[PDB]
């Protein structure tokens, strides 16, 4: 909840009706144009709305405002849900909005296209096939007498 709201810096453009700014302080946090921001929906139950702050201005009419450029999640698309809650999509949805509606500052990055990467097998845990369990890998050490042919599973199964 944003209650203490102060402009940071002198105004960058003036409409003679709006006065635009580059930065605003809200509570302790400082927020610039291009930062991203979180908004609680009209339905508190629904997930948070996320947006980029594209402009900050003071209106003769209306007060201390910003323009939200919305993101949307998978569930707002043909896709239904999606594997990662952190996943987001650009969408051409906007709104002027009072700065006091801002829940929190958030971090949204762009994820450039990646390549397949190293296709190698990996393991993390040991499977006790007798008792149907996963443990952390047993740390059974070899001697220097049998290092050259050591099998950890021979060692335990003896």
């Amino acid at each position: 909840s944003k209650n203490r709201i102060s402009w940071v810096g002198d105004a960058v453009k003036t409409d003679g009706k709006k006065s635009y700014y580059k930065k605003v302080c809200i509570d302790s946090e400082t927020l610039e144009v291009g930062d991203c921001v979180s908004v609680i929906p009209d339905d508190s139950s629904k997930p948070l709305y996320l947006a980029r702050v594209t402009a900050l201005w003071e209106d003769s009419s209306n007060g201390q405002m910003f323009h939200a450029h919305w993101f949307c999640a998978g569930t707002d698309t043909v896709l239904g849900a999606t594997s990662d809650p952190l996943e987001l999509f650009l969408v051409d949805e906007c709104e002027d909005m009072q700065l006091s509606y801002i829940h929190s500052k958030v971090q949204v990055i762009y994820k450039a296209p990646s390549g397949a990467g190293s296709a190698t097998y990996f393991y993390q845990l040991w499977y006790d096939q007798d008792y149907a369990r996963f443990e952390s890998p047993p740390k059974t050490q070899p001697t220097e007498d049998n290092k050259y042919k050591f099998c950890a599973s021979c060692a335990r199964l003896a």
């Binding site: 009209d42 949805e93 909005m97 006091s100």
Partner: peptide
Amino acid sequence: HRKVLRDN
């Protein structure tokens, strides 16, 4: 088109 219509 607006997406947040509450007032407070």
